[PDB]
Ligand binder design. Sequence first.
Ligand SMILES: NC(=O)c1ccc[n+]([C@@H]2O[C@H](COP(=O)([O-])OP(=O)(O)OC[C@H]3O[C@@H](n4cnc5c(N)ncnc54)[C@H](O)[C@@H]3O)[C@@H](O)[C@H]2O)c1
Ligand SMILES: [Mg+2]
Ligand code: NA
Length: 251
Amino acid sequence: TPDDLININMQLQKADSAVQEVTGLDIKGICKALYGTFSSSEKVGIVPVTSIGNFSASLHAITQYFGFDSFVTDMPDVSGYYEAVQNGAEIILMADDRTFLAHNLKNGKMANNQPCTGIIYAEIASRYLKADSKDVLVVGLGKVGFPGAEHLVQKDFRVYGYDADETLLERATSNLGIIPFDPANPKKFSIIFEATPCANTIPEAVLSENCVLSTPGIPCAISEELRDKYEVQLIAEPLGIGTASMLYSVL
Ligand SMILES: NC(=O)c1ccc[n+]([C@@H]2O[C@H](COP(=O)([O-])OP(=O)(O)OC[C@H]3O[C@@H](n4cnc5c(N)ncnc54)[C@H](O)[C@@H]3O)[C@@H](O)[C@H]2O)c1
Ligand SMILES: [Mg+2]
Ligand code: NA
């Protein structure tokens, strides 16, 4: 509500700075570099869906920050959708338990939260100013991680991948031509991308001093101890960066 407004706005400004530190660009600039696209106060309708609407309030906060004219509809679901279109929304933003989408009504473009999150976090990791090599470790090759790994291959990085499910590791190896990472033969990285719903997924063996860990993952892949010891540059934010990615991907 009131101090939460300050709280979300703080967390976004922090993340923006962490992104500036690592890449030289802010989140706005990353999206501009990623999609060749820019905010022009487009009207975005945030429609709550049945699946107390605090998530939509966060999205309102987040979209305001990036220079969009956003609103939350009074009605939820289909009534909400209708209210949004009728009130001049150019982009619809909405989520249920399994899908979070942004739909641009002007141009027909639609984004899914998961690939957009994976692409932007991978992009941020790839742009690490003080990285020594083009080698990158991706841990987690699910709905967020696989598209992030794909983005990294297309930017001609040498991508190593690991997933706890051999099945998903196999898929990525075949589809993307990434190198399977073996914990029995680790290697140090200066660039790490992690898309896992688990903590302590990044072993100490893999870390180098002043590496970037870029992770949308909840909770955090590295312990506070290890990120202190290695002075790990941490890119992690729970909703805003992914949301910006979506919005900018559809403009
Ligand atoms: N911060 C954001 O803005 C944002 C946006 C979208 C998703 N997320 C988060 O990103 C995370 C991943 O989302 P997703 O859709 O890719 O999940 P997913 O379930 O589709 O895939 C996650 C992958 O991580 C793998 N994994 C789990 N534990 C592992 C371990 N110990 N070592 C290696 N791999 C492991 C799983 O096998 C799975 O393939 C989730 O925690 C999700 O909440 C964050
Ligand atoms: Mg995010
Ligand atoms: Na994680």
